[PDB]
């Protein structure tokens, strides 16, 4: 019977598909590790696939995965227990050290480029033709932390040029330097921008960009990591 052959064949196809798909999803993070970074004994029943190489645009090189995995940064945590499976306690300030929900990855220290090779993200001041077209323009609003104190003022929006969207608010602090706050972690209101994740005293600690007119993938990761981390680590100062 042709229908019996079809269904039988299809189940065999589906098993192969699932195998292919799971191994494709092992191109990052594998092989698995013990808590000390050495290779785990039990890798599971799916083997690592044959590497593939992505050719990056704009002369940025290639990525070959799977490849040798490495954090490329010190992880300031220590065991809280003598056996496997327990949490790992921060050895200093987890917001400063970039662990837990304050974590960041050592992404490449260049800015993301758009399809023509220009910086993807720019302050609106430097982005020709770009303006606020709907909603409350936050530029000029005081910025309030979860302690209900004013941490600074909004001095620009950093926009994603190709996707025509707001990505950060640049916020000036008491001392006249600025910080980027992710747009996804602020609430624009009629008379203020409110920042739930950070109390006002934690604004100075937000990691800085080294050049004031662009931001690198590394820098975005440290900024976004740091402000997300305040949900857990600035909870004592949130009324």
């Amino acid at each position: 019977d042709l229908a019996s052959l079809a269904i039988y064949s299809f189940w065999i196809f589906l098993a192969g598909l699932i195998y292919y798909l799971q191994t494709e999803n092992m191109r990052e993070g594998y092989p698995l590790e013990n808590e000390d970074g050495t290779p785990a004994a039990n890798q599971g029943p799916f083997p690592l696939p044959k590497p593939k190489t992505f050719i990056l645009p704009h002369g940025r090189g290639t990525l070959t995965v799977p490849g040798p995995e490495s954090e490329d940064r010190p992880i300031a945590l220590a065991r809280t227990a003598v056996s496997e499976g327990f949490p790992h306690a921060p050895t200093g300030d987890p917001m400063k050290d970039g662990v837990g929900p304050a974590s960041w990855v050592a992404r490449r220290d260049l800015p993301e480029l758009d399809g023509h090779g220009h910086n993807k993200i720019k302050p609106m001041k430097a982005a020709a033709g770009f303006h606020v077209s709907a909603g409350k323009n936050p530029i000029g609003l005081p910025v309030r932390g979860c302690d209900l104190e004013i941490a600074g003022k909004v001095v620009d929006i950093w926009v994603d040029i190709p996707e025509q969207m707001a990505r950060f608010l640049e916020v000036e602090l008491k001392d006249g330097s600025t910080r980027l706050l992710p747009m996804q972690m602020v609430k624009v209101q009629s008379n203020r921008v409110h920042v739930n994740a950070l109390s006002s005293d934690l604004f100075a600690g937000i990691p800085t960009i080294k050049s004031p007119t662009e931001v690198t993938l590394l820098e975005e990761d440290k900024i976004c990591g740091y402000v997300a981390g305040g949900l857990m680590y600035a909870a004592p100062k949130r009324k």
Binding site: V132, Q164, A166, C224, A228
Partner: protein
Amino acid sequence: YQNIFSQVQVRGPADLGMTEDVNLANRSGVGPFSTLLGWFGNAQLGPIYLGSLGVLSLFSGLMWFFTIGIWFWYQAGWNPAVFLRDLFFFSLEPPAPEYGLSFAAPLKEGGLWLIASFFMFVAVWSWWGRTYLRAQALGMGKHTAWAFLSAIWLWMVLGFIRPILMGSWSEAVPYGIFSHLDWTNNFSLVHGNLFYNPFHGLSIAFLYGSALLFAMHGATILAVSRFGGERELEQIADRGTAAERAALFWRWTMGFNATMEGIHRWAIWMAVLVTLTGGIGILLSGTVVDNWYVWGQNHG
């Protein structure tokens, strides 16, 4: 703040797009900008590309649509009040069984259905070709066209392949809102209940799974958008804390996880297998299996 709607829109010069190997002669000018649309997605409408294959598809697609409409107006006695009243009850129906696979049927009793169907056939395949060709001009893989081919498969099975194998156009789906629903219901009753078709059951698993999966995935990317999660290509090329937190949410919940590229492979396939399996289940119905209850009792 949940990132379902944007809080502030920004706009700059119309984005005219990448050039690559595309014939610029065939792109329009940019259309208007919709502040409405821009609360959710992008505000910019157009430009659109319209070469000869696109004109063809767009002409045929409208001809298919108007042919059904002329017939609907006819059925309404040309009275607009009746046309709106009975809109969902009208039906352009295929030829009766006695004409088999021939083109000999009168215009009023099958022939207009073949004309409308011919135009639909031209509209879809040329739109399929356009899907491949637009990807080729930009240097992109052909995934969109291969994925579209799975939906085409169910459509071709319903209206063309299965009618041919069964010996007549009367097996095909009529053009009408209520009538195509009645056809669907009748088809299951006549074939011994489609819930006993294993291919129909798989199609359901995939349709349900597509909703499961895009809810998982959409929510996941929204949950990590505070770290740039939605920038999926660059997360692929250079893993960020967005992609790590996403994976780990799932690893910690259900014991395994995906990558930023690999989730899209789960996605394309969950979706494609809907119509793949579905089209097989339909093609086998009444060609090979007359009653799925019955077949199921023999397991085969």
